[model samples]
Target: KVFGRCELAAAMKRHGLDNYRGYSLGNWVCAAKFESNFNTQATNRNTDGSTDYGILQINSRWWCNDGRTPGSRNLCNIPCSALLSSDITASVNCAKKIVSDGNGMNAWVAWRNRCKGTDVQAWIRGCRL
Candidate 1:
């Protein structure tokens, strides 16, 4: 599913993470916007022989298991296919787990390269939440 800017932003807002781990609300909005262009079905196979899944692009190497990657952590303990579903609960929760880790949002290269230390207010602009 492809979510509109505010729609996606408000969705994450429902998670009570406006300031999750010191990362601003729009930081997630910004990260997902770039990571998958807000499409839950988006997936990317990395050069490391791992794949990224879902809107936040959760990785199969560390966050999830695709059963194809060697030595996957499967820290989320979920099938990677779950991340591709339109229901973002699993995806969001997994992302939260990633952010909670030592790297924080730095787990995502997109977040570090773009959303990190940047003003992402525009991502949630006009969202009711």
Candidate 2:
């Protein structure tokens, strides 16, 4: 479902990340906020001409389809469009796999440049988790 920032954070907490690779929920929320502003349908074209999809802005080069634009690794083995849904299951799963692949939240430049090493506690402030 489409979620406000706080709702998304709460859902993420309840959805059970369980410290995927030792990353925190705050990290995830921070990444989402900066990456897509919590909008599941968000997509952006990268400078390399590939695309970033969904809340995490997953790269078409390694994660999802490039819409017949060619030259995608599609490691997640699903259409990039799948990530745009509000359900967010596939998005979260693909992101988890991305973390396992050693990127962690560093997968998103927005997270590395903005969310990391900051007071990310504000990302989840006052959530009833």
Candidate 3:
């Protein structure tokens, strides 16, 4: 299911997204909005054949296992299917693992290419943590 911005903001906060790795709540909100538009079922096939999956558009190449992503390591040790559910906890936690794995938020190209160095506050304007 697709989420409204405010709902996603609040839910993301509960998942410990606020100030995660020095990024503000708006930063995560903006990136997720920009990347997948808060749709839990969102996915994209990459040019390399690895897939971007779920709300945060996590990649199968290093983060999750879809069983066919080339050179997949499944860092989060989860099936890509878990990422596509309405329950966003798996998505959020897996993303945190991505950070602890040392790529930081830089793993999400959308964050650096689009959400960074911008007025991300608008993404969570009317939403409270």
Candidate 4:
């Protein structure tokens, strides 16, 4: 999704997270949902960023392997899950590592991490990332 201001607001509502003045919450939520549906049971491949299996969308590359290969993006081996597991913990930790600035849902920071530009606030903060 493109995630305009209205779209971000909708995401915030859908996730039942705290309301943010700008798009940071929206960005974080967007990333969380896309990665793992804010779920605690998502799982993906560890190496090559493949099948990043877990709600927090943790890739095996970071933990299991160094995560460098030719076909690393093929991470969907486990499919979508919503139950607790070691994989889920890994994913959630990854999400928290990137986002979760004490209160969690820092859309601005999240947006910058993904978009990486000076006009972060100008861009919409939601996407499939």
Candidate 5:
């Protein structure tokens, strides 16, 4: 319940996926599989270290701090550094802003198509999001 509701909802909202619902679950799952491979703390270089950090590959060091900000509601603080934030949801939100200032969900759709396999692709096809 934690992941499906609170965490997932927060994640979706952060990514401007608040418009999504049960039908979009597959898309979200597809993103998780493709982006972080389900690893929350995973970090990798993005084309000559141009961007790195966070589960969804957010370049946090540029936005957040080196440690959790005081009285932060976000589950994981450790403010962003060269990375948006270590938090998966926060990274999602960050990606949303970086993509197109919330005008569209292209980044999410792109990652879904790129990372997800046939099974998930088929499942996502039925998703309304």
Candidate 6:
């Protein structure tokens, strides 16, 4: 579903992901903006022939299956298509699992490049929070 920044932020907060797994809400919000533009339908092909799925851009190599990539770990135990849906519960749960394994927010290239050292709070500016 199309989401306003504040709406997304509120959803994340309601799900206990405001600062989940040692990463700030800003990290998640900013990364979502660049990764998928807050659209759950987003998908992208990687250089390694894997595809990124959903708003968080979870990868097929470890999180989901594309049915084409062999030897996929599928750590999230979710179909790649599930991540493409408007309901983000699965995506959030899988993302939490991904981060809890010591990867933190560095798992997302968008966060690493755009949000890592920046004023992340600005991403949620004017939101009730």
TM per model? 0.95, 0.91, 0.94, 0.34, 0.47, 0.95
Query: Any residue pairs clashing in model 2, and if so which?
Result: none
lDDT rank order? 3, 6, 1, 2, 5, 4
For model 4 the TM-score comes to: 0.34
lDDT of 1 by residue, 27-69 (tens): 9989998899999999999999999998999989888989999
RMSD of each: 1.0, 1.5, 1.2, 9.6, 8.1, 1.0
For model 1 the local lDDT of residue 62 reads: 87
Residue 116 of model 5 has an lDDT of: 39
11-127: candidate 3 lDDT, tens digit per residue? 999989898887888988888887898899999999999999998999999889999987999989999999999999999999888866676777789998998899988899977
What lDDT does each candidate get? 0.88, 0.84, 0.89, 0.41, 0.47, 0.89
Q: Give candidate 2 regions above 4 Å deviation.
A: none
lDDT of model 2 at residue 118?
94
lDDT, residue 50, candidate 2: 88
Model 1 quality (TM-score)? 0.95
lDDT of 2 by residue, 9-103 (tens): 77777667647788788889989988898889898987888888898888898898867547788899899999999888888888888988866
Ranking by TM-score: 1, 6, 3, 2, 5, 4
Candidate 5: where are CA atoms >4 Å away?
1-23, 60-89, 102-105, 108-129
The residue-by-residue lDDT of candidate 4 on 1-129, one tens digit each, is 233444544544554433332335445444554555455455555433444444444444332332353333323332233223533333333444434445443322333465433444333444433
Model 2 Cα shift for residue 95 (angstroms): 0.2
Which candidate model has the greater TM-score, 4 or 6?
A: 6
Colliding residue pairs in candidate 3: none
Better of 2 and 4 by TM-score: 2
